Write an enzyme that holds these catalytic residues in place. Structure first.
Site, PDB file in Angstrom:
ATOM      1  N   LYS A 196       0.416  -1.317   0.287  1.00 18.65           N
ATOM      2  CA  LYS A 196      -0.101   0.034   0.005  1.00 18.65           C
ATOM      3  C   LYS A 196       1.279   1.397  -0.276  1.00 18.65           C
ATOM      4  CE  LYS A 196      -3.328   2.525   2.520  1.00 18.65           C
ATOM      5  NZ  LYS A 196      -5.019   2.110   3.320  1.00 18.65           N
ATOM      6  N   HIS A 198       2.438   5.536  -2.611  1.00 19.55           N
ATOM      7  CA  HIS A 198       3.971   6.969  -2.534  1.00 19.55           C
ATOM      8  C   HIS A 198       4.997   7.241  -3.102  1.00 19.55           C
ATOM      9  CE1 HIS A 198       1.850   8.938   0.462  1.00 19.55           C
ATOM     10  NE2 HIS A 198       1.537   7.647   1.473  1.00 19.55           N
ATOM     11  N   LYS A 239      -8.752  12.123  -2.086  1.00 25.49           N
ATOM     12  CA  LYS A 239      -8.427  12.100  -0.962  1.00 25.49           C
ATOM     13  C   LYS A 239      -7.317  14.030  -0.557  1.00 25.49           C
ATOM     14  CE  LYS A 239      -3.965  10.162   0.866  1.00 25.49           C
ATOM     15  NZ  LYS A 239      -2.658   9.277   1.821  1.00 25.49           N
ATOM     16  N   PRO A 240      -7.280  14.007   0.274  1.00 22.41           N
ATOM     17  CA  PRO A 240      -6.779  15.511   0.343  1.00 22.41           C
ATOM     18  C   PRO A 240      -5.663  15.992  -0.486  1.00 22.41           C
ATOM     19  CG  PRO A 240      -8.267  14.641   1.727  1.00 22.41           C
ATOM     20  CD  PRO A 240      -7.674  13.344   1.549  1.00 22.41           C
ATOM     21  N   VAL A 241      -4.336  14.904   0.828  1.00 19.73           N
ATOM     22  CA  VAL A 241      -3.158  15.169  -0.002  1.00 19.73           C
ATOM     23  C   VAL A 241      -2.139  14.192  -0.448  1.00 19.73           C
ATOM     24  CG1 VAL A 241      -3.097  17.621   1.411  1.00 19.73           C
ATOM     25  CG2 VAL A 241      -3.189  15.291   2.384  1.00 19.73           C
ATOM     26  N   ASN A 242      -1.345  13.806  -0.310  1.00 18.82           N
ATOM     27  CA  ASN A 242      -0.665  12.972  -1.180  1.00 18.82           C
ATOM     28  C   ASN A 242      -0.054  13.350  -0.944  1.00 18.82           C
ATOM     29  OD1 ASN A 242      -0.626   9.658  -0.661  1.00 18.82           O
ATOM     30  ND2 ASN A 242      -0.181  10.073  -2.669  1.00 18.82           N
ATOM     31  N   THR A 243       1.659  12.856  -1.442  1.00 18.80           N
ATOM     32  CA  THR A 243       2.797  13.012  -2.084  1.00 18.80           C
ATOM     33  C   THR A 243       3.778  11.614  -1.803  1.00 18.80           C
ATOM     34  OG1 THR A 243       3.485  14.420  -0.163  1.00 18.80           O
ATOM     35  CG2 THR A 243       5.145  13.256  -0.904  1.00 18.80           C
ATOM     36  N   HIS A 262       3.766   4.251   6.344  1.00 19.49           N
ATOM     37  CA  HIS A 262       3.214   5.312   6.069  1.00 19.49           C
ATOM     38  C   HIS A 262       4.245   6.523   5.922  1.00 19.49           C
ATOM     39  CE1 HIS A 262       1.154   8.897   7.910  1.00 19.49           C
ATOM     40  NE2 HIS A 262       1.814   8.720   8.777  1.00 19.49           N
ATOM     41  N   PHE A 263       3.871   7.373   5.272  1.00 14.08           N
ATOM     42  CA  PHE A 263       3.957   8.815   4.807  1.00 14.08           C
ATOM     43  C   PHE A 263       4.118   9.426   5.887  1.00 14.08           C
ATOM     44  CE2 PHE A 263       7.040  10.839   1.824  1.00 14.08           C
ATOM     45  CZ  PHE A 263       6.737  12.508   2.360  1.00 14.08           C
ATOM     46  N   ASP A 264       4.681  10.295   6.742  1.00  8.81           N
ATOM     47  CA  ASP A 264       4.542  10.871   7.482  1.00  8.81           C
ATOM     48  C   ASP A 264       4.616  12.441   7.744  1.00  8.81           C
ATOM     49  OD1 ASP A 264       3.469  10.821  10.180  1.00  8.81           O
ATOM     50  OD2 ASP A 264       5.712  11.581  11.643  1.00  8.81           O
TER      51      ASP A 264
END
Length: 124
Positions: free
Chosen positions: A7, A12, A41-45, A119-121
């Site tokens: 995932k 990411h 999804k509001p924000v993502n890197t 997880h991307f923090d």
């Protein structure tokens, strides 16, 4: 059964492009990585480094996670990334995003055996 590690790769990782390909990059990538399927999804890197380089962050600088857990790690080197942020006019299912390229240290949460990003923090 998509694993947590898979995932993270879907949500990411984008090693294929060295930087935010175009102004349409987030619009295409948020859709194709299934981040607009149920909701925008509001924000993502997305990270434009090799998988091995991102996985190696799990043995780099230990820092507190935003949620107060202790399993987050900050890359010693900067990495090429693309931040995607939903525009104010974006309305599902036609999710619209601004594409911004940056070179920052990434912070990821790592878990498991092998100990890998899940997880991307943050980026700093």
């Amino acid at each position: 059964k998509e694993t947590a590690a898979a995932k993270f790769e879907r949500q990411h990782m984008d090693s294929s492009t060295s930087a935010a390909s175009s102004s349409n990059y987030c619009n295409q990538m948020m859709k194709s990585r299934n981040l607009t399927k149920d909701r925008c999804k509001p924000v993502n890197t997305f990270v434009h480094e090799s998988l091995a380089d991102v996985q190696a962050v799990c043995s780099q600088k230990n820092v507190a996670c935003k949620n107060g857990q202790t399993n987050c790690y900050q890359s010693y080197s900067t990495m090429s990334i693309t931040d995607c942020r939903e525009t104010g006019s974006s309305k599902y299912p036609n999710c619209a995003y601004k594409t911004t390229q940056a070179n920052k240290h990434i912070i990821v949460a790592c878990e498991g055996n092998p100990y890998v990003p899940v997880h991307f923090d943050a980026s700093v």
